[PDB]
DNA sequence: AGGACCC
DNA sequence: GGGGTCCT
């Protein structure tokens, strides 16, 4: 039952894609901009003080000569992200995506099949590729260490193929489960890889300084733990299971406390094609109102091409909006409805827009002043 | 339809 | 910001 899981995580992904298109940017500090946001930047910019998700002002001041490129259209990042998953799928079919630039692959079978092929006296020649977390000593007679080192060799083949075939560099983490592979993959960056031997697990988990650093504990849950006086990984590990459940539900409570020890039994699952296709536009009060028709028509036009290009067809459409002000929860609202079977045919635009516009009015009272900062359209329930 | 999480 | 996943 012991697995060897690899987590691959590309370097500064959007900036990396822009640097490749336009090598004139290869040596300049570079930031990818969406509205007033520097969503990410290359490693030249992270030297000069720029952070991911820093607004343009803080970043131009921290680095005046920061070159900026617009990254609001994700089409190119999207396309590259699938070329990566597809290439990893040649190694093992079951690849799980997490966002546009991370993949997990279960290497156990590949590892076992490579071990099956080594003769008695070349087992002792097995070596690591890249870093060993916490510099831990290898024990060549420990079969778990052996299988992890073969895992590290496979990861280095995957990184070399991504570079040689797609021009992309990234990091990899090899460990016994997904949580640990993903934590260890960030230890040496950019463009490096690390393997976690089982004895250093507690060390890696206790190296985190904030409980939100655990994948699966987000903004909301962390705020609730903070309020319970839970602040370190160890505070979570040792806190009352009963009380935790009462304050967060058997579900959230029991999975996070498990994660706090480094335990994660979830399988790597095959992502395959996408479950939804969406586009959004953000703006400052631009919409009020029914020119949204324009706005909604443009989203729709690009979305229609994507779903067309996909070749499965969608059966539900949804419209998402967001309303202006204030310090409270500015949550989104939406309306969905099925797409008429006759329309399921890829004129199209006109009845698709009529539908969206109806969903629009259902949400917004057109008789008073509107109040909108976001329009989004989603196609889903693909079939 | 909303919400939590991820990138 | 501009995307995604799955759950209640
Ligand atoms: N809240 C977020 C997080 C990420 N991204 C985008 C920008 C990144 O280029 C890409 C990958 O996210 P990562 O967190 O892996 O960030 P990077 O790949 O840019 O940097 P690193 O080298 O730290 O992985 O997803 C985004 O738009 N919004
Ligand atoms: Mg990442
Ligand atoms: Mg990355
Ligand atoms: Mg991915
Ligand atoms: Na987290």
Question: Do A92 and A60 share a domain, yes or no?
Answer: no
Distance CA A184, CA A186 (A): 5
CB A103 within 8 A of CB A96: yes
Question: Do A165 and A43 share a domain, yes or no?
Answer: no
What is the residue range of A53's domain? 12-73
Distance CA A276, CA A49 (A): 36
Give me the catalytic one of A102, A213, A245, A297.
Answer: A102
CB A194 within 8 A of CB A187: yes
Output the six-digit token pair for A343: 């329309």
CB A177 within 8 A of CB A5: yes
Q: For residue A41, give the nearest of A8, A82, A71 by alpha carbon.
A: A71
A269-304 as b/e: b if 16+ CB within 10 A: eebeebeebebebeeeeebebeebeebbbebbeebb
Whether A102 sits among the annotated catalytic residues: the reply is: yes
Output the six-digit token pair for A29: 């500090």
Residue at a domain's end among A224, A245, A273: A273
A274 CB less than 7 Å from any atom of strand B: no
Which ligand is closest to the CA of A189, given by its number?
1
Give the dihedral sign, CA A346/A348/A351/A357: positive
> What is the count of structural domains for chain A?
4
Question: Do A229 and A371 share a domain, yes or no?
Answer: no
Question: Do A185 and A88 share a domain, yes or no?
Answer: yes
Task: Write the secondary structure of chain A as one string of H (helix), E (strand) and C (coil).
Answer: CCCCEEEEEECCHHHHHHHHHCHHHCCCCEEEEECCEEEEECHHHHHCCCCCCEEHHHHHHHCCCCEEEECCCCHHHHHHHHHHHHHHHHHCCCEEEECCCEEEEECHHHHHHHHCCCCHHHCCCCCCCCEEHHHCCCCCCCHHHHHHHHHHHHHHHHHHHHHHHHCCCEEEEEECCHHHHHHHHCCCCCCCEEECCHHHHHHHHHCCCCHHHCCCCCHHHHHHHHHCCCCCHHHHHHCCHHHHHHHHHHHHHHHHHHHHCCCCCCCCCCCCCCCEEEEEEEEEEEECCCCHHHHHHHHHHHHHHHHHHHCCCEEEEEEEEEECCCCCCCCCEEEEEECCCCCCCCCCHHHHHHHHHHHHHHHCCCCCCCCEEEEEEEEEEEC
Burial status of residue A23 (CB atoms within 10 A of its CB: 0-12, 13-18, 19 or more): exposed
Output phi, psi for A169, to 5 deg: -110, 150
Omega within 30 of 0 (cis) for the link into A191: no
Omega within 30 of 0 (cis) for the link into A190: yes
Question: Do A4 and A49 share a domain, yes or no?
Answer: no
Give the dihedral sign, CA A141/A143/A144/A145: positive
Which of A18, A70, A101 has most ligand 1 atoms within 8 Å of CB, for mutation? A101
Distance CA A5, CA A13 (A): 22
Distance CA A272, CA A290 (A): 38
Q: Which residues contact A50 (CB under 8 A, 6 or more apart)?
A: A29, A31, A38, A41, A59, A62, A63, A66
CATH code where residue A366 lies: 3.30.1490.100
Residue at a domain's end among A273, A294, A325: A273
Query: Residue A212 CA to C6 C1' — how many Å?
Result: 20
A9-22 as b/e: b if 16+ CB within 10 A: bbbbbbbbbbbeee
Burial status of residue A308 (CB atoms within 10 A of its CB: 0-12, 13-18, 19 or more): exposed
CATH code where residue A216 lies: 1.10.150.20
CB A254 within 8 A of CB A263: no
Strand-pairing partners, residue A382, are A314
Burial status of residue A66 (CB atoms within 10 A of its CB: 0-12, 13-18, 19 or more): buried
A219-227 and A241-260 helices, crossing angle to 10°: 130
Atom number in ligand 1 closest to CA A99 = 25
State this model's resolution in angstroms. Answer: 2.0
Distance CA A275, CA A192 (A): 32
CB A175 within 8 A of CB A205: no
Residue at a domain's end among A34, A49, A73: A73
CB A45 within 8 A of CB A205: no
Question: Do A162 and A56 share a domain, yes or no?
Answer: no
Q: Which residues contact A175 (CB under 8 A, 6 or more apart)?
A: A5, A7, A148, A181, A183, A184, A195, A196
Q: For residue A104, give the nearest of A195, A178, A168 by alpha carbon.
A: A178
Question: Do A255 and A324 share a domain, yes or no?
Answer: no
Cα–Cα distances (Å) from A211 to A66, A135, A188, A222, A381, in that order, read: 33, 24, 21, 7, 35
Other CB atoms within 10 A of residue A337 CB: 14
CATH code where residue A116 lies: 3.30.70.270
Q: Say how many Å lie between the CA of residue A95 and the centre of ligand 4.
A: 9
Question: Do A78 and A164 share a domain, yes or no?
Answer: yes
Chain B positions within 7 A of any protein Cβ atom are: 1-7
CATH code where residue A51 lies: 3.40.1170.60
Strands A193-195 and A102-106: unpaired
Distance CA A50, CA A101 (A): 20
Chain C positions within 7 A of any protein Cβ atom are: 1-8
Can you tell me which residue has its alpha carbon closest to the C1' of nucleotide B5?
A: A216
Question: Do A291 and A379 share a domain, yes or no?
Answer: yes
Other CB atoms within 10 A of residue A80 CB: 20
Cα of first residue to Cα of last residue in chain A, in angstroms, is 35
Q: Say how many Å lie between the CA of residue A378 and the centre of ligand 1.
A: 22
Which ligand is closest to the CA of A13, given by its number?
1
Distance CA A187, CA A293 (A): 48
Question: Do A192 and A330 share a domain, yes or no?
Answer: no
Question: Do A115 and A4 share a domain, yes or no?
Answer: yes
Question: Do A174 and A90 share a domain, yes or no?
Answer: yes
Query: Residue A331 CA to B3 C1' — how many Å?
Result: 10
Ligand 1 binding residues, C-beta < 6 A: A 9-14, 39-40, 52, 99-101, 190
Give the gyration radius of chain A's Cα atoms.
Answer: 24
Can you tell me which residue has its alpha carbon closest to the C1' of nucleotide B1?
A: A334
Length of chain A: 383
Distance CA A272, CA A269 (A): 9
Burial status of residue A75 (CB atoms within 10 A of its CB: 0-12, 13-18, 19 or more): exposed
Q: For residue A281, give the nearest of A378, A379, A375 by alpha carbon.
A: A375
């Amino acid at each position: 039952s012991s697995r060897v899981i690899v987590h691959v995580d590309l370097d500064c992904f959007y900036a990396q894609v822009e640097m490749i298109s336009n090598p004139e940017l290869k040596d300049k500090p570079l930031g990818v901009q969406q509205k007033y946001l520097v969503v990410t930047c290359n490693y030249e910019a992270r030297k000069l003080g720029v952070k991911k998700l820093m607004n343009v002002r803080d970043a131009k001041e921290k680095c005046p000569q920061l070159v900026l490129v617009n990254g609001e259209d994700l089409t190119r990042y999207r396309e590259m992200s699938y070329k990566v998953t597809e290439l990893l799928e040649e190694f093992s079919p079951v690849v799980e995506r997490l966002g546009f630039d991370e993949n997990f692959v279960d290497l156990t079978e590949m590892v076992e099949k490579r071990l099956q092929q080594l003769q008695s006296d070349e087992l002792s020649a097995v070596t690591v590729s890249g870093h060993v977390y916490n510099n831990q000593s290898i024990n060549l007679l420990d079969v778990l260490h052996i299988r992890l080192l073969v895992g590290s060799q496979i990861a280095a083949e995957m990184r070399e193929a991504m570079y040689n075939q797609l021009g992309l560099t990234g990091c990899a983490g090899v460990a016994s489960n997904k949580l640990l592979a993903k934590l260890v993959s960030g230890v040496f960056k950019p463009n490096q890889q690390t393997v976690l031997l089982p004895e250093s697990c507690q060390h890696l988990i206790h190296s985190l300084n904030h409980i939100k650093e655990i994948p699966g504990i987000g903004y909301k849950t962390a705020k609730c733990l903070e309020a319970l006086g839970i602040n370190s990984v160890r505070d979570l590990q040792t806190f009352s299971p009963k009380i935790l459940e009462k304050e967060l539900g058997i579900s959230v409570a029991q999975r996070i406390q498990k994660l706090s020890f480094g335990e994660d039994n979830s399988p790597v699952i095959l992502s395959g094609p996408p479950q939804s296709f969406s586009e959004e536009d953000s703006f400052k009060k631009c919409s009020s109102e029914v020119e949204a028709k324009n706005k909604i028509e443009e989203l729709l036009a690009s979305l229609l091409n994507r779903v067309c290009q996909d070749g499965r067809k969608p059966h539900t459409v949804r419209l998402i909006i967001r309303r202006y002000s204030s310090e409270k929860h500015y949550g989104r609202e939406s309306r969905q409805c099925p797409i008429p079977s006759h329309v399921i045919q890829k004129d199209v635009m006109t009845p698709m827009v009529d539908i969206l516009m109806k969903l629009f009015r259902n949400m917004v009272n057109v008789k008073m002043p509107f109040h909108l900062t976001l329009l989004s359209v989603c196609f889903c329930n693909l079939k």
